[PDB]
Every structure is written in C-alpha cells, then in structure tokens.
Design a protein around this ligand. Sequence first.
Ligand SMILES: CC(C)NC(=O)COc1cccc(-c2nc(Nc3ccc4[nH]ncc4c3)c3ccccc3n2)c1
Length: 327
Amino acid sequence: GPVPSRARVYTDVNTHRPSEYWDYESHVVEWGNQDDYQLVRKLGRGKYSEVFEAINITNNEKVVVKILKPVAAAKIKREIKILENLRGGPNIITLADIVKDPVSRTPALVFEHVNNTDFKQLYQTLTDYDIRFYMYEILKALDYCHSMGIMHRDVKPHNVMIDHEHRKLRLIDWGLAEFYHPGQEYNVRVASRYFKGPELLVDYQMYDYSLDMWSLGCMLASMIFRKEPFFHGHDNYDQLVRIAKVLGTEDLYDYIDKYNIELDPRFNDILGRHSRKRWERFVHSENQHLVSPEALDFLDKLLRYDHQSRLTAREAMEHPYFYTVVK
Ligand SMILES: CC(C)NC(=O)COc1cccc(-c2nc(Nc3ccc4[nH]ncc4c3)c3ccccc3n2)c1
C-alpha cells in the first residue's frame, strides 16, 4: 500500500492545542444581530454559498455577507472555527460576525469588505514589482494559516481579493480549509482543477500544507509567463499529463515510486514519455519583462512533484525573488 507522509513543518501544532482549537464539531456559535446587516446587492454564487455586498447599519460600514447553502452539509462549523482561529492573522479575511439568515435559516458569515478589482483585469496586468509584492502578501497568509495548523486547499486567483489602490490583499473562501493532523488521510477532491497538486491527481490522501505551495506556484507561473492557466487540463487526468509535459515523466515515476502509489491505469494510454523542459521555453517577447533568474529559481522550487521537497511558505519568503520588495 502507499508509504505514509508527514509535513516537514508545523507537524504537531494541533496535537498540542486543546481539542477546543481543532474539534470544530464541539464549537458553539455566538450569534450576532441579523438586523445589524442590510443586503445591498448579490456579488457572487458558488456551489456552497451566495455572497452579498451589505451595509452594517450600526456604523454605516460596507461588509460582505456569505449565506451558506444547506448543501454545506453542516461543515459550516469547520469554516467558522477556522475563520475564528485565524482572525487577525496577516492578510486573512476578517470574520466580523455570524448571524442567522431569516430566509435561508442557515448561518450568514459577515466579513470585512475588500474593494476588489477583477483578477482577469489585474493578475495578467501587474508589473514585475507588483507580482513580487502581492506574492509576498499571499505568503504571509499561507505561513500564518500553516503555522496555525490549517491548510487552505483552494488557493487560486479568485480566492485572493486585492484592493490595488490601497495595496491591500486578503485570502478568502476558507470553506475547503482543513486542520492538519499528522497521518490523517484527506479527501483529494479539493482545489480547482488547474491548481490541483500532483498528490491530488495521483489520489495520494496523506497530503499537507505543501498542497497550497503547489497551487501558489501555479498562480506564479500564470502571472510571470502571462499564460492563464499555466497547466490547462481538459479534465483531472489530462491535468496530470499537462504537468508531466513540463516537469517530465521520469520525476513523476520517481515520485509515485517513493510513496508506493499506483497510477490509475487510465494513464497508460495518455501519459506518454516527456522530458523535463527548461523554464526558458515559456519566455517570449510579451512576458520577458516579468521573468528573471530569481523568478525561475523560485518557481522551480514550488512546482515539484514531491510535496515534501517544495519550499514551505516561510522558506519562500526568504527567497531572493523578494529581496526587491520593500519590507
Ligand atoms: C461580474 C462579477 C465580477 N462576477 C461574479 O459573478 C463574482 O464577482 C465577485 C466579486 C467580488 C467577490 C466575489 C466573491 N466573493 C466571495 N467572498 C468574499 C468574502 C469576503 C469579502 N470581502 N471583500 C470581498 C469579499 C468576498 C465568494 C465566496 C464564495 C463564493 C463566491 C464568492 N464570490 C465575487
């Protein structure tokens, strides 16, 4: 059977906290006043929630209200507990309140408002300096949540709200986030197809915080190479083939051999045999201004098949790529 795996960092944070911290099923919700909040306009819908621009009539401040569909299946408590654990962490969306929605009869999460500018207008229009700056701000969020025993599991441009005017970033949508417990097997049906780590795609369940660092590498590659998305799978199988056409099949086989993973036999007809490509093959006249030796070295150390070999968020923040960012 598969060889087990453990994170190389923050392995035992949860084992040493009182059950109060990670036992989200035991958590009792403190309800605020639903009458404090007036919905202004629908902003978005996902498969698990509807999001609204709202006003807090007690202070006239803009808020965002996320009304959970009942389909959450009660995992509302994990999201609430994670949001409360992380509250006030650097670049973590701030949960202001939890009220009972009178219509849905489900919890409505009240968040601070970020005046977001659209990613499809932003992340493919930023400067070299701004890519470095915002990546550093995302790393602060990821090292904070990892240090607090939490993996986000849905890092992608849509879950990063940026107020480009105030140089303000928040990591949002913690509805897939989970507490890391060493030796625990997790559901591989997390993250969005283009950001899914190889561990998910080969059905390796004993994964950890390092899944977020793969997702972040997918975001960086799309930004520096101006290619959305970078790994453009037609489905979850083709997603691994797209990765293997860049990183090569020999390192893929070494990875699944290390963890004693058997590839789905569906791959025998579609994977082929691929060399690792040099990152310079993706450089062209339209994206060269965003590419440096430091950018490629950093990307190279995120986009590794072996989840244990990837930079941690804290190691990533030490990388030369960020030396130019004002701290
Ligand atoms: C034409 C528009 C542009 N196209 C859309 O149809 C969606 O647009 C938006 C715009 C802004 C935010 C969101 C949004 N936010 C979400 N949480 C959220 C939470 C706290 C927040 N503080 N400030 C912003 C914000 C957003 C969200 C969560 C789950 C599912 C979907 C979500 N969606 C969507």
